[PDB]
Each structure stands twice: as structure tokens, then as C-alpha cells.
Amino acid sequence: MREDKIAAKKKLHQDKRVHELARVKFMQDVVNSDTFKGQPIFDHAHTREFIQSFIERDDTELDELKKKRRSNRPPSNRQVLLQQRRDQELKEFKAGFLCPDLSDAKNMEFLRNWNGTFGLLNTLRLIRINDKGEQVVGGNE
């Protein structure tokens, strides 16, 4: 009903979304933890493995909606909407998802040293990867 005398002051720099950062954070954390600490470098098969898990994580969340369906209260709109975002995310992946090559040890070490740095997201060996680790190029040959 009421607003304060102060208006919502704004930021000058545009923020990057977690769709980019959390993706690297996952890869980083996996390497930095005993999860795959024994594995120094990965490949493009592990690319799809981790990339798809990052996207399809929505289904793990959607599963809770599928769960509360038995509570006799399913989210008619939001359960569909959640799945619709998956279609969009998969479509971006299908158009070459912004993924590290994951096989370059220089890139992987920078990936390890990601201190939540935005500029580091430009120094990383990030390319566009489709499906099974396919190289997405605009057309240079």
C-alpha cells in the first residue's frame, strides 16, 4: 500500500545469471570435492553427463511436484511451466550450450580457481557444445 520515500536504487552493471555461473561452480565443486577429486581432467562424454544433469535438475524439482500430486494438490499450471523451461534450456543446449571443453588442463585449473569471478568467465575455455560434446561453430570453413 505504502512505498518508502526512497525509490528502489539500481545497479549500473548488468548481472550474470546463475545459468552460467552455477554451471561452472558445479564442475569446479565436483573436481574440488572427493566426488571426482581422483579425476584431474574429463572428456566430452562427461560433458553431456554433467551438462545434462545441470539442465535436467529441473526434473528432480519437478519430481517433488509429481510427489505432492498424491497430496491431492498438483500445481496445474506451474508443473507444466516448470517442464516448459526445460524445453527452453534443452533448446539452448541443442543450439550449442556454453560449456568448457573440459579436457584442457589449463581451462580445468582455471575452472578449479573460480572464486566466483565474472571476468574469469571470459578467461575460461568456454565453447558451444551440442548433445554429446559436439563442436558448435558458426561457419569458419
Phi, psi and omega in degrees: 000310181256144169249151176291165179292332177277133177272161179296103180287146194246165180263148183272328179266133178286130183279150173271145185271157185295347180296332177268308188289314184294333177297313178290320180301320177299307179304313179302305183301321178299319179287322186281342178259166181288001175305305177223029179302327178290343180257114182283314184229151179244189181227188182281341174288318174291337173305296180302321179308303182283322180298312181295320178299321180296319180285307186288359171306335179298328182288328175296325179281321177296329179299326177293329175288322176295333180286313183287354173301326180282348175281002177072023180214082174269140177286091186308317183271310190288332178292326176283315181303318178300315179293328180294328178293324176303314179303317178295312181296319177293329180290325177289323175296320178293339178261017181090094181285143180286094185232146170295151178296330170074002181244347177276120186289340176286310177302315181296330180282322172297320177300324177289328186262019177288103181267036186069039185262131182281320178294333180292339181283357176253337181271347177284154179276073183262128179231181176260117184245132180246136170057266189259015184103032183276142183282114178266115178236151180287333181128087182245005179206000000 
